[PDB]
Amino acid sequence: EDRLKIDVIDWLVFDPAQRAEALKQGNAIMRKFLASKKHEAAKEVFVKIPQDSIAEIYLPAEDDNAIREHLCIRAYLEAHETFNEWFKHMNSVPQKPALIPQPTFTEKVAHEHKEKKYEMDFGIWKGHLDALTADVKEKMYNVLLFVDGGWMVDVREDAKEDHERTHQMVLLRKLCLPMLCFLLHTILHSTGQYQECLQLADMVSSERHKLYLVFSKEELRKLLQKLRESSLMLLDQGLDPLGYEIQ
Amino acid sequence: SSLDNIEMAYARQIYIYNEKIVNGHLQPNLVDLCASVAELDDKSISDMWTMVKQMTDVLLTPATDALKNRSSVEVRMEFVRQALAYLEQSYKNYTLVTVFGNLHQAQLGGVPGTYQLVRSFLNIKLPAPLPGLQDGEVEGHPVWALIYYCMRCGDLLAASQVVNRAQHQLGEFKTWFQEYMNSKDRRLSPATENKLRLHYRRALRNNTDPYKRAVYCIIGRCDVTDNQSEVADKTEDYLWLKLNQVCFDPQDRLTLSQFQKQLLEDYGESHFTVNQQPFLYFQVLFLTAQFEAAVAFLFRMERLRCHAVHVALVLFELKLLLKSSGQSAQLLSHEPGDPPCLRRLNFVRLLMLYTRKFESTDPREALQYFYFLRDEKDSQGENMFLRCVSELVIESREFDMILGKLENDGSRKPGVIDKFTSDTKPIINKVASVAENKGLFEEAAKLYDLAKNADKVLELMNKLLSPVVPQISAPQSNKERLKNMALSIAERYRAQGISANKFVDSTFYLLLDLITFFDEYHSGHIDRAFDIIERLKLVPLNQESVEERVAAFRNFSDEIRHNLSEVLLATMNILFTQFKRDRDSQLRSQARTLITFAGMIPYRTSGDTNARLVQMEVLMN
């Protein structure tokens, strides 16, 4: 039935006079797929939506929200497109030169070089990494700290009742905000940014976002056993739990 | 079964004719093989084949083109004689059943001489004397009646005897007739032929004795327009009257081409089928050498399809049927670069129609008829018989019966097509090819495996396994039903030393090992399952192997990379369980290895997997 739904979109996109209904329905369809984490499904739909839809449509409470929801959804997708690239890279680290104990004088020199070339690649694989870390992070904070009212949260409050959508928007927050936090923690930990890891407890507990309400009690503790792990590595470095110099 | 009693009997006869050619034996007489069934039906059909045999029993030039034999004046002349000999003998049987009530009744008393029969035939059909007869009588009958019906029965000798007893009355007709009986091809010399024709035309154009009129222009082949309707009232009497009047190379003359065309063009089926008697028209076309017309015509009668197809086959196995080159033409047509007086039969279409009826539930019999198309191809080059077997297998789905079932023990019990050609590698791929194009992989594998095409068998077997690698193998599941066939293909491929290219082959045996890895993992045999994954050297367990294992993943079949997620988790969960039961350092070290590998590998669900892997390693410490 996947196709039935992703195909009803091209029918609504065809007629430009129904772009407001095409987007709204595109949202709904992408709300079902997100709850299943079908990101190639959600995105295959996301491209069918002409890149210039938003511009033309220009506002009923149903169109202000659907424009916001669409960008929220793009902010979410882009937060998985850049992580899978980053993650793919983290798993392609240059491998150490192989050792040939009891080497011939030939094998000694081939190895002096293979050992010197590797000490060039590992520097760039931290180079490319840093730039894929700086980018995946930004996206994770665009979703977690979504501007003007939080992620998947309507700004317009005068639409007509849509319990399906509304409760779909509360759910999407409870499936994906705990899951984006845990990823960002995994990104920060993987790159050794431990001080910042611990600063996820400010972001989450914050009264500005009230992200902690989107967490189950279990997920919290789990995030608290994740932070205590970053803390350790900060002690091993000689700093206090939170990364500040011990005077 | 879709075959009626008559059709079935013909099928068996065509199986024999095929069994003979398939084993190289003598080419038996097809016409005889078909008349063998005709006698099981009413004589309406028997008398047809009698005509078919006698019309095709002409001295031919073996290994000569069909169009050439049928255009040659040599052959065209013998057709007329074979027909006249049929119309004469056929009429002779009518004269017997007219005098005696049954052919058997005539035989027991003995067939009388054609003279005494004819005399005993005149008694009935003219009891009282007609006042317009001439030249007196002979032993109680008009001399001209005896001469006509004797010639009609085909016994010229019996007719000449009548002439010898009326020498004084008949005048100069004796020396003329005695020449006709002597000269071959039922023709007189131009000089004498001129003498009699002018005499008849002089003052006998309208004589009160119709029998006299008939004989004269049967001997002189004159007055072609006058159908002598006084004596030739039946249709066969007309055909016979005219075939004794046709000529070969300008006035008062008729040729076979004109006559054959004149008959069906001006007086088509409509004229000869008003009495709702179909064979009457068929005999008109067949006894005039228009075999294609008669075949198509008779092929449309839904009750006589069987008979018309076979009379086509006979004409086809005798190089007498004129096939239509193009397969896009109608059933009956005249080629543009041929004379208008001949027609052509789209033989390919003819059989294709007949077959569709009983091809669905009677495949064996269908093949016997498809064989006659072995000598023809299509626009794309395929062999028509081979293509017909492909289409018949795609539709009927009768693989074991027609293609030969390849059991799971390594045997190949031959199929019905094996009889006709020993090169069965292409069609098995053709049938396997489409079923592959229709997502029927489990079948395409069995079919490709039937032709020992391991390149395709293992390819498809890779696709059917990868989805089911991590699944739970349960009784009658789709895993068991696929794993058990894959293993039955692994043994038969090792015992027979068969293998595809190493890429396809390596992946195939690799999946089989993984399927064993999860079957042991889902059973709780942790120790045993850990040992298997270690052999495969697919997931690194010591930090030193990470570099090489990571490079290998890049060129491993995507059917493997797909299942990498479930492999890492099972392997981790394996170490995970063994931890709760120095060794602790060793598991801890291996735990780390899996993570770094997964970290450097971009793969399916790397997000959820890499996270779970790290959590399970933390609980260990």
Q: Between chains, do B547 and A186 touch, taking CB under 8 Å as contact?
A: no
CA B18 vs. chain centroid, Å, equals 12
Q: Which among B514, B441, B512, B523 has a CA at the least distance from the CA of B474? A: B523
DSSP B187-241: ---HHHHHHHHHHHHHH-SS-S-HHHHHHHHHHTT--TT---TTT--SHHHHHHH
3-state percent breakdown (helix, strand, coil) of chain B, nearest 5: 65, 5, 30
Which residues from chain B sit within 8 angstroms of residue A88, using beta carbons? 601-603, 606
SS3 B10: helix
Structure tokens at B472: 């739970």
Query: Which of B543, B550, B554, B600 has the highest number of chain A CBs within 10 A, making it the mutation to test binding with A?
Result: B600
- Please say whether the beta carbons of B6 and B37 come within 8 A: yes
Distance CA(B298)–CA(B277), nearest Å, equals: 11
Return the amino acid letter for B345: L
- Please say whether the beta carbons of B514 and B469 come within 8 A: yes
Burial readout A81-96 (b: 16 or more C-beta within 10 A, e: otherwise): ebbbebbbbbbbbbbe
Which residues from chain B sit within 8 angstroms of residue A231, using beta carbons? none
Structure tokens at B164: 């010898």
Distance CA(B230)–CA(B211), nearest Å, equals: 8
Which residues from chain A sit within 8 angstroms of residue B598, using beta carbons? 91
Structure tokens at B303: 């009750």
Distance CA(B321)–CA(B315), nearest Å, equals: 5
DSSP alpha helix (H) spans, B537-605: 546-553, 558-561, 564-580, 583-600
Structure tokens at B459: 């390819």
- Please say whether the beta carbons of B590 and B579 come within 8 A: no
Structure tokens at A103: 């080497």
Structure tokens at B594: 């899996």
SS3 B498: coil
Maximum CA pair distance of chain B?
Answer: 142
Which residues from chain A sit within 8 angstroms of residue B548, using beta carbons? 95, 98
Q: How far is A66 from chain B (nearest CA, A)?
A: 28
DSSP A77-137: HHHHHHHHHHHHHHT-PPPPPPP-SS--HHHHHHHHHHHHHHHHHHHHHHHHHHHHHHHHH
Check CB contact of A84 with chain B, cutoff 8 Å. Answer: yes
Nearest CA in chain B to A129: B600
Strands B137-138 and B141-142: antiparallel
SS3 B323: strand
Burial readout B526-544 (b: 16 or more C-beta within 10 A, e: otherwise): beebbebbeeeebbbbeee
Distance CA(B150)–CA(B164), nearest Å, equals: 14
Distance CA(B387)–CA(B430), nearest Å, equals: 9
SS3 B171: coil
Distance CA(B548)–CA(B600), nearest Å, equals: 12
Give CA separation, B345 vs B83, B290, B368, B372, B548, in Å. Answer: 22, 11, 20, 15, 71
Strands B246-247 and B332-333: unpaired
Distance CA(B131)–CA(B294), nearest Å, equals: 42
The last residues before gaps in chain A (C-N over 2.5 Å) are 58
| Phi and psi torsions of A99, nearest 5° | -95, 135
Query: Which of A95, A180, A221 has the highest number of chain B CBs within 10 A, making it the mutation to test binding with B?
Result: A95
Structure tokens at B323: 């096939």
| Phi and psi torsions of B137, nearest 5° | -115, 175
Q: In sequence order, which residues have a C-beta less than 8 Å from that of residue B571 and are 6 or more positions away?
A: B530, B533, B539, B594
Strand partners, B247: B255
| Phi and psi torsions of B474, nearest 5° | -125, 155
Q: How far is B347 from chain A (nearest CA, A)?
A: 47
Distance CA(B118)–CA(B95), nearest Å, equals: 7
| Phi and psi torsions of B254, nearest 5° | -130, 140
- Please say whether the beta carbons of A151 and A144 come within 8 A: yes
- Residue with tokens 């709904």, as numbered in its chain: A28
Distance CA(B155)–CA(B117), nearest Å, equals: 11
DSSP A12-76: HHHSGGGHHHHHHHHHHHHHHHHTTT-HHHHHHHHHHS-TTHHHHH---HHHHHHHHHHHHHHHH
Q: Between chains, do B602 and A91 touch, taking CB under 8 Å as contact?
A: yes
Q: Between chains, do A183 and B618 touch, taking CB under 8 Å as contact?
A: no
- Please say whether the beta carbons of B432 and B456 come within 8 A: yes
Which of B548, B599, B618 is nearest residue A91 as measured by Cβ atoms?
A: B599
Q: Between chains, do A95 and B546 touch, taking CB under 8 Å as contact?
A: yes
DSSP 8-state class, residue B111: P
Strands B254-255 and B332-333: unpaired
Distance CA(B188)–CA(B218), nearest Å, equals: 11
Check CB contact of B542 with chain A, cutoff 8 Å. Answer: no
Element (H, E) at B377: none
Element (H, E) at B344: strand B344-345
SS3 A239: coil
Q: In sequence order, which residues have a C-beta less than 8 Å from that of residue B167 and are 6 or more positions away?
A: B174
Which residues from chain B sit within 8 angstroms of residue A80, using beta carbons? 607
Structure tokens at B394: 């795609």
Which residues from chain A sit within 8 angstroms of residue B610, using beta carbons? 87, 186
Which residues from chain B sit within 8 angstroms of residue A114, using beta carbons? none
At CA B7, angle to CA B3 and CA B9, rounded to 5? 115
Three-class HEC string of B348-369: HHHHHHHHHHHCCCCHHHHHHH
Return the amino acid letter for B597: F
SS3 B592: helix
CA quadruple A195, A196, A199, A204: dihedral sign: negative
Give CA separation, B101 vs B107, B118, B125, in Å. Answer: 11, 16, 15
Check CB contact of B600 with chain A, cutoff 8 Å. Answer: yes
Q: In sequence order, which residues have a C-beta less than 8 Å from that of residue B147 and are 6 or more positions away?
A: B159, B162, B163, B211, B215
SS3 B141: strand
Distance CA(B427)–CA(B447), nearest Å, equals: 10
Distance CA(B575)–CA(B527), nearest Å, equals: 10
Q: Between chains, do A92 and B598 touch, taking CB under 8 Å as contact?
A: no
Residue B130 region by backbone torsions, left for phi larger than 0, else alpha for psi between -120 and 50, else beta: beta
Q: Between chains, do B610 and A95 touch, taking CB under 8 Å as contact?
A: no
Check CB contact of A126 with chain B, cutoff 8 Å. Answer: no
Distance CA(B147)–CA(B129), nearest Å, equals: 16
Distance CA(B2)–CA(B11), nearest Å, equals: 12
Return the amino acid letter for B321: L
- Please say whether the beta carbons of B607 and A84 come within 8 A: yes
Give CA separation, B502 vs B81, B250, B451, B507, in Å. Answer: 73, 83, 20, 8
Q: Between chains, do A92 and B611 touch, taking CB under 8 Å as contact?
A: no
DSSP 8-state class, residue B139: T
Return the amino acid letter for A73: I
Distance CA(B349)–CA(B346), nearest Å, equals: 6
Long-range pairs for A211-217 at CB < 8 Å and ≥24 separation? A211/A144, A211/A177, A211/A181, A214/A173, A214/A174, A214/A177, A214/A178, A215/A174, A215/A177, A215/A178, A216/A174, A216/A178
Distance CA(B449)–CA(B547), nearest Å, equals: 39
Which residues from chain A sit within 8 angstroms of residue B597, using beta carbons? 91
Structure tokens at B338: 């041929």
Q: How far is B555 from chain A (nearest CA, A)?
A: 14
Query: Which of B554, B605, B610 has the highest number of chain A CBs within 10 A, making it the mutation to test binding with A?
Result: B610
In residues, how long is chain B?
621
Distance CA(B461)–CA(B444), nearest Å, equals: 10
Distance CA(B579)–CA(B573), nearest Å, equals: 10
Which residues from chain A sit within 8 angstroms of residue B550, using beta carbons? 91-93, 95
Strands B246-247 and B254-255: parallel
DSSP B391-449: HHHHHH--HIIIII-B-TTS-B---GGGGT-S--HHHHHHHHHHHHHTT-HHHHHHHHH
Give CA separation, A79 vs A7, A9, B98, B172, B333, in Å. Answer: 25, 24, 105, 122, 72
- Please say whether the beta carbons of B129 and B141 come within 8 A: no
- Please say whether the beta carbons of B1 and B361 come within 8 A: yes
Distance CA(B85)–CA(B90), nearest Å, equals: 8
Burial readout B441-468 (b: 16 or more C-beta within 10 A, e: otherwise): bebbbbbbbbbebbebbbbbbbebbbeb
- Please say whether the beta carbons of B572 and B597 come within 8 A: no
| Phi and psi torsions of B111, nearest 5° | -60, 120
- Please say whether the beta carbons of B41 and B13 come within 8 A: no
CA B411 vs. chain centroid, Å, equals 30
Check CB contact of A89 with chain B, cutoff 8 Å. Answer: yes
Resolution (angstroms) stands at: 37.0
Check CB contact of A95 with chain B, cutoff 8 Å. Answer: yes
The last residues before gaps in chain B (C-N over 2.5 Å) are 249, 581
Query: Which of B553, B594, B606 has the highest number of chain A CBs within 10 A, making it the mutation to test binding with A?
Result: B606
Structure tokens at A77: 């997708």
Q: How far is B315 from chain A (nearest CA, A)?
A: 57
Q: Which among A79, A77, A8 has a CA at the least distance from the CA of A38? A: A77
CA A174 vs. chain centroid, Å, equals 14
CA A226 vs. chain centroid, Å, equals 18
Which residues from chain A sit within 8 angstroms of residue B611, using beta carbons? 182-183, 186
Q: Between chains, do B597 and A95 touch, taking CB under 8 Å as contact?
A: no
Count other Cβ atoms within 10 Å, centred on residue B117: 23
Burial readout B51-86 (b: 16 or more C-beta within 10 A, e: otherwise): bbbbbbebeeeeeeeeeebbeeeebbebbbebbbeb
Distance CA(B316)–CA(B24), nearest Å, equals: 19
Distance CA(B311)–CA(B49), nearest Å, equals: 8
DSSP B442-468: HHHHHHHHHTT-HHHHHHHHHHHHGGG
DSSP A141-210: HHHHT-TTT-TT--S---SPP-HHHHHHHHHHHHHHHHHHHHHHHHHHHHTT-HHHHHTHHHHHH-TTT-
Check CB contact of B550 with chain A, cutoff 8 Å. Answer: yes
- Please say whether the beta carbons of B11 and B368 come within 8 A: yes
Structure tokens at B385: 């018989």
At CA A219, angle to CA B571 and CA A132, rounded to 5? 70
Strands B246-247 and B141-142: unpaired
Check CB contact of B614 with chain A, cutoff 8 Å. Answer: yes
Distance CA(B196)–CA(B170), nearest Å, equals: 13
Structure tokens at B378: 């299509």
Q: Which among B414, B368, B458 has a CA at the least distance from the CA of B10? A: B368
SS3 B138: strand
Describe the crossing of helices B73-99 and B43-56 by its angle, rounded to 10 degrees.
150
Q: How far is A93 from chain B (nearest CA, A)?
A: 6
Distance CA(A89)–CA(A98), nearest Å, equals: 22
